[PDB]
């Protein structure tokens, strides 16, 4: 079901074409090509734009169009730890399934998609804060090590959303972790038409719209 | 049992008419047509003006008028705690009842009214107040992450009140996000007459006021 209107998106066809071109392509190709080339599968994406401008709209639709297990979504900075250390336990409990699957099966495991709402809530300048407790540094470093480090990962996809790309530490943006970046500006006239239609199909279905409109 | 006069608010008839039209229109018509439309109720209202113009009393009376449960009010920044993480835990407990009730019955639950006083005390511009502990930026992120997001809620209504509407977040006042933004202004002569009559009703009824006035 790749209708793209049954799903309900505001004429963002070109956006999806470009994202599939850039990524999700090595994902549907012969592994043998990936051995001759030796190019790894991209595992980082970012979607930012006018606050809630259909920013979570497609985030709530991608979970359907995929023939793998339902992607796990993290809704905002709920990684709270009251005693000591369990913030790093929470961060750990996100990637356990990927580790287990990769150990169980390799080169054909599948994909696991993780979504961080309010990325900006938890990822800021490491040294800027002067607070006595350094929890933010602790979580930032743990996440950095998990996404990138001596240990290798090949069956994950991290997606990040912020309504203000500015308060983000540059270390997390180094090439090889979140190299890809994309913006969602505003809807064209033509896309506005499809939008109106999508937002008015039921209206016309039950004969509640005056022909003058 | 009800009456507009019973409340004892005068001079804001247009304001009440607009509020009722844009807030309570979908909650009074027979369910069949509204359900045939697939429209989501508005769940946001914001008020502001100079002190002593009857903003507090307005919310007091609007809450009292409903045949719903007693509204839960928050008196300024009263949801802060001395530890890491319980600003969010406090801003999150406010929605347990609505979520539970929606999941038990669904589509037939009563409204849940929440009132914030001086919203500007807690919710302000992210990227500002560059002090320490980043708690404010975390609270704002949670509040938005919870008013809207991956989960759906249709039995809530939030009222905010401020005096300096230029310091609130942009998305917090966007569509479906305190979208209705009203403007209470100093009364007119007719408003003055109505007000004086309202505050001089218990006197004429006991012959305690001389007819000379």
């Amino acid at each position: 079901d790749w209708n793209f209107e049954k799903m309900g998106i505001g004429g963002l066809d070109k956006e999806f074409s470009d994202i599939f071109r850039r990524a999700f392509a090595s994902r549907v190709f012969p592994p043998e090509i990936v051995e001759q080339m030796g190019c790894k599968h991209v595992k980082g994406i970012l979607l930012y734009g006018p606050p809630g401008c259909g920013k979570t709209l497609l985030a709530r639709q991608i979970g359907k169009m995929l023939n793998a297990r339902e992607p796990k979504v993290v809704n905002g900075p709920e990684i709270l730890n009251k005693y000591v250390g369990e913030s790093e336990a929470n961060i750990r409990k996100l990637f356990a399934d990927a580790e287990e699957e990769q150990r169980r099966l390799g080169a054909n495991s599948g994909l696991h998609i993780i979504i961080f709402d309010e990325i900006d809530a938890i990822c800021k300048q490491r040294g800027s804060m002067a607070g006595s407790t350094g929890v933010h540094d602790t979580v930032v470093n743990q996440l950095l090590s998990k996404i990138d480090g001596v240990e290798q990962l090949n069956n994950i996809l991290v997606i990040g959303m912020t309504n203000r790309p500015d308060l983000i530490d540059e270390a997390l943006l180094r090439p090889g972790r979140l190299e890809v970046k994309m913006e969602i500006g505003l809807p064209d006239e033509k896309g506005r038409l499809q939008i109106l239609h999508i937002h008015t199909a039921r209206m016309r279905g039950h004969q509640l719209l005056s022909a003058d409109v | 049992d009800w009456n507009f006069e019973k409340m004892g608010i005068g001079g804001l008839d247009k304001e009440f008419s607009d509020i009722f039209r844009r807030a309570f229109a979908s909650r009074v018509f027979p369910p069949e047509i509204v359900e045939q439309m697939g429209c989501k109720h508005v769940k946001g209202i914001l008020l502001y003006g100079p002190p002593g113009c009857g903003k507090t009393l307005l919310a007091r009376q609007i809450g009292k008028m409903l045949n719903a449960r007693e509204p839960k009010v928050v008196n300024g920044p009263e949801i802060l705690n001395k530890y890491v993480g319980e600003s969010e835990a406090n801003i999150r407990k406010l929605f347990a009842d609505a979520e539970e009730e929606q999941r038990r019955l669904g589509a037939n639950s009563g409204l849940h009214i929440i009132i914030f006083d001086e919203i500007d005390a807690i919710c302000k511009q992210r990227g500002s107040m560059a002090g320490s502990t980043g708690v404010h930026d975390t609270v704002v992120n949670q509040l938005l992450s919870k008013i809207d997001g991956v989960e759906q809620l249709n039995n809530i209504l939030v009222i905010g009140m401020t005096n300096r509407p230029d310091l609130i977040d942009e998305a917090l006042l966007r569509p479906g996000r305190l979208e209705v933004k009203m403007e209470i202004g100093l009364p007119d002569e007719k408003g003055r007459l109505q007000i004086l009559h309202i505050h001089t009703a218990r006197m004429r009824g006991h012959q305690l006021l001389s007819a000379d006035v």
Binding site: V84, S132, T133 | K82, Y83, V84, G131
Partner: peptide
């Protein structure tokens, strides 16, 4: 002039009172 403070908790599960009751009972 500036600065604010913070606080934190830890895993302690002492319950020395109950352990003291128990061990005293053991002694008797």
């Amino acid at each position: 002039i500036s600065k604010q403070a913070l606080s934190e908790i830890e895993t302690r599960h002492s319950e020395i009172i109950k352990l003291e009751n128990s061990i005293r009972e053991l002694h008797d």
